Design a protein around this ligand. Sequence first.
Ligand SMILES: O=C(N[C@@H](Cc1ccccc1)C(=O)NCCc1cc(Cl)ccc1-n1cnnn1)c1ccc2[nH]c(=O)cc(O)c2c1
Length: 238
Amino acid sequence: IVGGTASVRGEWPWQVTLHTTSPTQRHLCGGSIIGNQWILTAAHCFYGVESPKILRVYSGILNQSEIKEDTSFFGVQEIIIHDQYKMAESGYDIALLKLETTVGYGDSQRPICLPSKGDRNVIYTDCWVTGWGYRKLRDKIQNTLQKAKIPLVTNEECQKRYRGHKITHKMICAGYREGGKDACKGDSGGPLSCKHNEVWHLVGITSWGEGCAQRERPGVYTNVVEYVDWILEKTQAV
Ligand SMILES: O=C(N[C@@H](Cc1ccccc1)C(=O)NCCc1cc(Cl)ccc1-n1cnnn1)c1ccc2[nH]c(=O)cc(O)c2c1
């Protein structure tokens, strides 16, 4: 996160750190708890990931230094990638991780609500992007979970900023016209969480952008409201 501040423990209890054990143990992507055995994340995170066996999900983490070999985690049973996904820049940048065991909800880990399909006509004014990603394009993975308040940008305005790309209504952008606050490397897959009527909603999934926090280059997120049916299809299968 560029231009963010340290989060407080328990602030974003739906936020997870997805780690990989191949070739070495490292943070791979962010993710969000959406159900007791479900993590919502980005499809681009699994480029070259051949098996769910190399993945570990850690919930209730403020600091990456909390993670050692004796730290509890959730194994991944299945990786479900949207079948229309080709690349982040083209959309459908969404995936579900079915966990091998259920998450016990508490004050350190709980699910974030998905946006209500009836509320596609609501204006979100209190949106935050969170993650352990870089503070600048040439940086490193942060120990403490960072947060940044970012204003949502219209599809029309975001399309003006990305000449040569096709910003679809399945994408949602956020950023200041002058830049300064954004997601960066390591933040992808994480949430863009918006508080409306005292309830937090998973409005976006960190996906792509031209550099980090550049002037007139908003961050591009998967517009979660447009995938509610797909999430229900996959999580509520008979
Ligand atoms: O590049 C990374 N992540 C990419 C995506 C990815 C995922 C998995 C493997 C490879 C690449 C990312 O977050 N990409 C974020 C995309 C992005 C989103 C938005 Cl909304 C705005 C601006 C941007 N950026 C544009 N350029 N940088 N960020 C990434 C992930 C985990 C890492 N762990 C480490 O220990 C060391 C790393 O250097 C490291 C880097």
